[PDB]
Amino acid sequence: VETISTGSLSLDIALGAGGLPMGRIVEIYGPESSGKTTLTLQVIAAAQREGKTCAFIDAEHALDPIYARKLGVDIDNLLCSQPDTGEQALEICDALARSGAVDVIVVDSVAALTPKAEIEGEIGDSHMGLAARMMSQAMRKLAGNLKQSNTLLIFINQIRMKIGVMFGNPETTTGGNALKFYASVRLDIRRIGAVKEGENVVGSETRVKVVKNKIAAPFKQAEFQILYGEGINFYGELVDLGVKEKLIEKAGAWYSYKGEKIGQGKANATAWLKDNPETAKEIEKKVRELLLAIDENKQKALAAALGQIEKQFGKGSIMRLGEDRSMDVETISTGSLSLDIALGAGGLPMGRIVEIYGPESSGKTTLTLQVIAAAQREGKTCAFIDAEHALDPIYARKLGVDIDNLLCSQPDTGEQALEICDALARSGAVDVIVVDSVAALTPKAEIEGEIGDSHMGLAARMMSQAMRKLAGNLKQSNTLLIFINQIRMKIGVMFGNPETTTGGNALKFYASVRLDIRRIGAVKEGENVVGSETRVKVVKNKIAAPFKQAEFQILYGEGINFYGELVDLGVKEKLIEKAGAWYSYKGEKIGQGKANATAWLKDNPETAKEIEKKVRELLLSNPNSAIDENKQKALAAALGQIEKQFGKGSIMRLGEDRSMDVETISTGSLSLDIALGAGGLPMGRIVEIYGPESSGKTTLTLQVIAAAQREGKTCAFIDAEHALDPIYARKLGVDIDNLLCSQPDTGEQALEICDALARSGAVDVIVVDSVAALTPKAEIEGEIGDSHMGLAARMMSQAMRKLAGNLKQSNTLLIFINQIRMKIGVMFGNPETTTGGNALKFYASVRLDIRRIGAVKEGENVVGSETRVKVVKNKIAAPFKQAEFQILYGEGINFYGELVDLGVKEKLIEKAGAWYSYKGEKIGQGKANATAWLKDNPETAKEIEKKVRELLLSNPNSAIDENKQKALAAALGQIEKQFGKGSIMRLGEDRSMDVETISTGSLSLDIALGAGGLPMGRIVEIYGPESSGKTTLTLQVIAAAQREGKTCAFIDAEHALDPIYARKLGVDIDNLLCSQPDTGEQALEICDALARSGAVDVIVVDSVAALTPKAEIEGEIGDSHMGLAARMMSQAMRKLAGNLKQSNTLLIFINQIRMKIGVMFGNPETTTGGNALKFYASVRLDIRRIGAVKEGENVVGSETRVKVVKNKIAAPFKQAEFQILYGEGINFYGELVDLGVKEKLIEKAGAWYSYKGEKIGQGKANATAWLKDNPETAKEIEKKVRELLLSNPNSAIDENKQKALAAALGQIEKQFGKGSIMRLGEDRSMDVETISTGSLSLDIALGAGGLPMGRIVEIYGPESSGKTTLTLQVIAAAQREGKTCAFIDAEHALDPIYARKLGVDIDNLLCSQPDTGEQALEICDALARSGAVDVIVVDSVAALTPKAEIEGEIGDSHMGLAARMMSQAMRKLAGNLKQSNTLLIFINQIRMKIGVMFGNPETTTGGNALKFYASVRLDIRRIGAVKEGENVVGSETRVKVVKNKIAAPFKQAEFQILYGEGINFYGELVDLGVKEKLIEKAGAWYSYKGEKIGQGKANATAWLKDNPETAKEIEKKVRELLLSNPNSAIDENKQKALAAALGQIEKQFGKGSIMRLGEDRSMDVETISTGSLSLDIALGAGGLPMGRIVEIYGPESSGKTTLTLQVIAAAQREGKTCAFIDAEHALDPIYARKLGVDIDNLLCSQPDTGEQALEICDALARSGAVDVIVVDSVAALTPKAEIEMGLAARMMSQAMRKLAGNLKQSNTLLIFINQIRNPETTTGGNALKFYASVRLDIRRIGAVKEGENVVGSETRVKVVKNKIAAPFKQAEFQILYGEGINFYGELVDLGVKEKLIEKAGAWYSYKGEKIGQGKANATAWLKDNPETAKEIEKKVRELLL
DNA sequence: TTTTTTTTTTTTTTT
């Protein structure tokens, strides 16, 4: 075992044997740029440092001599071979081994050991693993000759990935397994990081694993540094090793040796060991010890082997490196100086391969051409492989390229492409070949195969074979090869960056330079975009230091600003002077501004060269180092060679390529054609148009079709979107009869059609409506919810690959329409993207951003989309120029409109005010008349058009047709024969295409729709507010569809459809299919299967917002499934549109409104389920409730407005206003009436409505009920109305339906369960089951007699309104019926004892005080899912604080984090609620939206989410008092029904809430009995059936209480009379799933997460003294509740702070700790003391910010260490930002949210003092008001006088809020200054009022004994006798508590 | 024998 150094110690160490074994084989493999070759050379260096001879086989053809030298290699003494064939390569190894003259041979890249046969055969064939069997034969031979020569052989090898293997790692080596075995060492080298000189990248942090070892232990690893231009940091390691082995001292940053300090920092420990090699050896050796006639026989057999190899293989087969002339680093200009500088070697190396990759439009091709220009500027010949089929000749010229002298190939196949490269290299006639897009090097097999055939990485193995071949022919031809490549992302990767190149890793390695070009910004002429600010990174470099970057400008139509750079570089290097704006050279002023420094160096090229060169000298760390008739002889022999192999025009000069020409078509928009620069869309290229839904994508598309068919070209349309209107297409000037149209099933199909249409060359222009609808086969056949991640994309990238070629050689223009989608979570630039991956982006020769920017108005009517289109990609002319115009609906682009404007701006048309003139002659007054005259004179229009074009374009235009229709109808029939009958046909004769429309159930709507209804086979979205009428309208189109014998399906994803109501809307309940799906996936898969059956005519989906993804449901509430919803929608749309159109099944989606937070443009209204829907929808509907329809008192109708916000069917934006009567629906005939009136079809003489003379009814109400009565007349009127106002009029059978219906039924049932889908009429879980509210009039107003089971109910209202109360009362009357209730006291303010006084079973009531809102809801979820709870209630959604918010600080902006939590919760809950028949009540608080000037600024918390899902929304309010004369005993209360899905809404309920009793149920009963004549009222007496029941309502109350028999009897008959929606082994299955859910919740969230109320110990009403007895008395509960929040407010000087301190005193008197937040900055310590406060023990904060203030509260609560915190003045809780507009409030509301929880579980009482600002209010918004369990109105009412001196504030304190006892009781006492509350003072008064103390005038007596004359003396005596005081105190307490 | 290609929003906030 003889070992050589590796040149890396840690490596030698990891090797175990101290190096690489002699006579053995070693493989080093690793990534491109890893350091394979480097390491190699370093073992060579340290072998030549020991007098051993090395040979190098640069099979890679990429060894840098000069570098080799910088690595310590003896260049002059190193043998070097650049062998042609691998065989050669190895035979050399063999002969060098056999000589025994070489000690170490290395082979740079076995991957480049190309077999003979492979090189002399083509690129593409099957010589498969010929490489390997060569390796295995070589190994076989070599090992023997190696050991008996003790010759060490190193193989460098590359990494390759074998497709589709998922065992461990798909990393492999080249040259088969052969090597692997024979190797005695295998080495995994890698670059792991950077070594940085701060800015400069100077080193490859490198790791090398021993993956095979026959020499010592394997797998030991070695980590070190490879400094570029030096090699391995040997001493670097030495250092570390010395450190680890205690040979070098490290005291912090200082490194010592034997006591003597060697350097501070590792960088200085390095440079000292370098300086002292004596010491280094000494350390090196001791480290090693610790961790591990002779030479003239050589040179005689050396030179005999030399000559042997030379004699077999040719002249310079092998030679010394130092004297290799073909080896030299020859560099070409890039056309960018800073680039040449960053390259280090001044350019791109000749004979090597260079890859340039970067984004679409980056400048890849551009840069390419610029190196071509500057190569042709030096008399070198260039070849171009436009595999991309998108090189602009004319542009090439503008870049300085010699078009006439530049070779150009547009190859069909990639193989072809490369074989051309090969033959051009082999000729040595081309100096530089470039390949535009390896990504377009489509393999033969792929082109001939279909789109969708998996040729997985066939591309790659082609590349790896090509590289193999090319590098050799490149170096011996000194031919530089540039590859342009595209960016693609590898899906699912979580490391580093998912950016990659095409054509596999192959390229990466072989490349001697790899270039990351990018567009980083704009270069602006102010308005015009003229330049791509561009950055190019050197990502691979074999030539000099990598990673140096180059930043410059690419001016369009000029190229790289070469001199631009020169300038800057001159500036930075002090070669050019810059004094402000002036640029000087050698004193002489060259230009003011960089723009003038540019144009002067351009003007003086003598000076430029002089500067260029000196710059180069200064910044290049790798400087440059019968003749031409031998070229053109082998040029034209290769030319003809390529021509003879591949066809006529396989290759030719650019200047004379006729298929190349930039031929352009009109867009149908002039300004667009102008912005395009080239006057239109390029033929044979691909164009992408993307933009918003309704933008005009499809429209524009058709308009280029029109103007193409206007020039006799044939167009094909791929309506992948399944939403093209034939009739409309016609109105756009399209030849419907002559336009090919495909509605393909699969995207593959779609594209294969494109392919076959291109290949025929018969179509001139194909357009594809929505790549976003190019659904892959696998996706359609698979389910919705199957992850086919970017299957779409790899389909696109394969399609592009194929199409571009067939497009250019067919001059067929391909337009792709695409949609916008957002990439979630991105914080840079704009989150706008396209579908179908980046693929498209690159291939496109034009990319178009169309948008709707405004309206075009005929005053009232919306008639036009003011439209803007940006050129975002341009390969044709200058990009980014924009085009603004008008799209009139039913006409298209106002072409002439533009013409006009353009004529105006260019002085071709005269404008004198309003008159437009041409050549003097007046053409029209107003633009509208300038329009209609140019329309009338097309001769003049052309004349103007052309001259405009001449003036504003910067790239002007430059047996035949029976060959088309012969290959047309052969392709037609081809497509028809592959894919079916009507796969493709002329538009004009498509019967499935027809715009078939259904009634909406609203005429004015059908009218506004323009086409008389909703289109069949299309998707319609209806969105709008909660209660708007979405579901309603839905059902009404269902009714009028079932009225025409069509079958409807309903997806009640919302879980809130009323069967009974559905019926009242005219829906056939028995015949209506209904699904309440669990998951959205389910929901959609149902849609899919219903569409696919073609058995349903119309499916509707109630709330996409409720299409909860599987993962979301199974996951928790609070798990971020960000837009998982969306990608589900976008997959669903993709699938559905196809199955919808071929089933003519109309799909309606109902969706909800949500706001996007933080947006300052337009309107923050949006839809759920992402943009997906928006596009696919053929109609989008904005429904709204705008007003009331009133029967005087009763609210009976939703005055309703519906906007058409999207329309693919007719003109959009027309609006429809009508009435939705509850329990009847839309008043269809209502409209009919109005419409008849407006159109003079019905007569109106005042109030009388007449028809044809005959009087039909007085009043609209009577015109209604008569048309209802005569449907004959109604139809007759309906139709004539329609004729008059529609600018888009209407245009064995059924046993095939019910056969595929019941097969789909059973299909859905079999996939998803029993009652997944069924007829409405027989759904038992659907039934409207109602619970009592505990308030009759409420149950009455509800219409359905109570709250619906399985639904969600929101009750909102003011603080103290009675929200919680009402809640409990429905709980009581639910537990009174044996139902189980759960309570989520998120508010942390439910009184157990009170709950009891309300009739609630405390012992049987589940109660949760959850920490987080997530928790809160997850509890709801688990309680619903158990089905064990019948009714859950949540006290304050406003207290459902999100985790993040709780853990985050108060003042952290979690903007509407609350909401997205709610919307996720709703999503989840409604389903689990209905299938558990569990009623969920949410209590919520009122908040105001600031700055709103409409209606009412009242809102709810937790976003709109709740609002929609709720089946009932309840506005409770306190309206007045119920008085026992003096005492306030009752909250006179009013509750509005603000949402109702259950019966008629808006009916109101007024009643009484007695405190300590609850709702006076019977109270209502009484009134109701009175109003309904069931109870007699003769004045004050109330009678029943004659018998007198009580005088006064108070006595009518207490008698019904006493006779519950009579009460039920009255109750029921009342109910019968006023409800317009009447009511419709068992319990041991409950308590079994109850206690399993109990334990479930307990096990997830902790011990006392949930428990019975009666046994909650943290719940207890624990009270503290206020320091004022009468106050404690008025409080009712004897003080302030612990764990709750209390607000005390009152006037300045009132005594707020005082009182505060007094509760503190009496808390510290009971050994509790108090904290004070003197936010007011005005607490007197000394005074605090005089009030009995322990100053030394009282915590005090004077916080700067309110946030601070609260965060302190939070942390004090959370510690549970403070018992009572007080905050002096919320009014002084100034928000941070306000030091640095109700910012105050949203801070309060966030604080409350957080605090209440931490307060109750800490039993920490929080007092807030607040100020006053009846117009009396508090600061810090309503937030406080609600959360407070007590609110206190303190006031100073008078003086307490010592005669003269004022000594006391006579003080009054009202209880204005109380959750603890009866409110409103008041407390009057004295606050003596310097003493505080006169405790005994009160005692006195109280004693007086309660007859415990005698008062005979002025004398106060106790038990007869006289205690003092005057209250002042009754005071000072009780002070003196505390025994007596306690005795009185206690008896008072007994009496009044 | 040698990769293949993205995927799609998310939800108010509070005198």
Ligand SMILES: Nc1ncnc2c1ncn2[C@@H]1O[C@H](COP(=O)(O)OP(=O)(O)O)[C@@H](O)[C@H]1O
């Ligand atoms: N024919 C042309 N006329 C004017 N500008 C062009 C032309 N072709 C491309 N450009 C512009 O030059 C820049 C780089 O183009 P290019 O190098 O073709 O992109 P890629 O890197 O995708 O090959 C882009 O901003 C593009 O808009």
Ligand SMILES: Nc1ncnc2c1ncn2[C@@H]1O[C@H](COP(=O)(O)OP(=O)(O)O)[C@@H](O)[C@H]1O
């Ligand atoms: N523990 C209690 N004892 C007596 N009365 C109470 C108690 N809690 C609340 N009240 C009274 O009942 C009415 C409604 O209280 P509540 O429903 O808690 O208000 P909210 O609607 O804010 O939840 C109020 O007038 C209040 O003063």
Ligand SMILES: Nc1ncnc2c1ncn2[C@@H]1O[C@H](COP(=O)(O)OP(=O)(O)O)[C@@H](O)[C@H]1O
């Ligand atoms: N530093 C002080 N020394 C003596 N008396 C004070 C002091 N501060 C306040 N007072 C008196 O105590 C009473 C209540 O003060 P305070 O509670 O601060 O009023 P507010 O209710 O506005 O906070 C007032 O009559 C005031 O004059």
Ligand code: ALF
């Ligand atoms: F074509 Al669209 F929304 F994608 F109308």
Ligand code: ALF
């Ligand atoms: F004394 Al003040 F609010 F007026 F604390």
Ligand SMILES: [Mg+2]
């Ligand atoms: Mg190398």
Ligand SMILES: [Mg+2]
């Ligand atoms: Mg290009």
Ligand SMILES: [Mg+2]
């Ligand atoms: Mg469209």
Ligand SMILES: [Mg+2]
């Ligand atoms: Mg609804």
Ligand SMILES: [Mg+2]
């Ligand atoms: Mg409450």
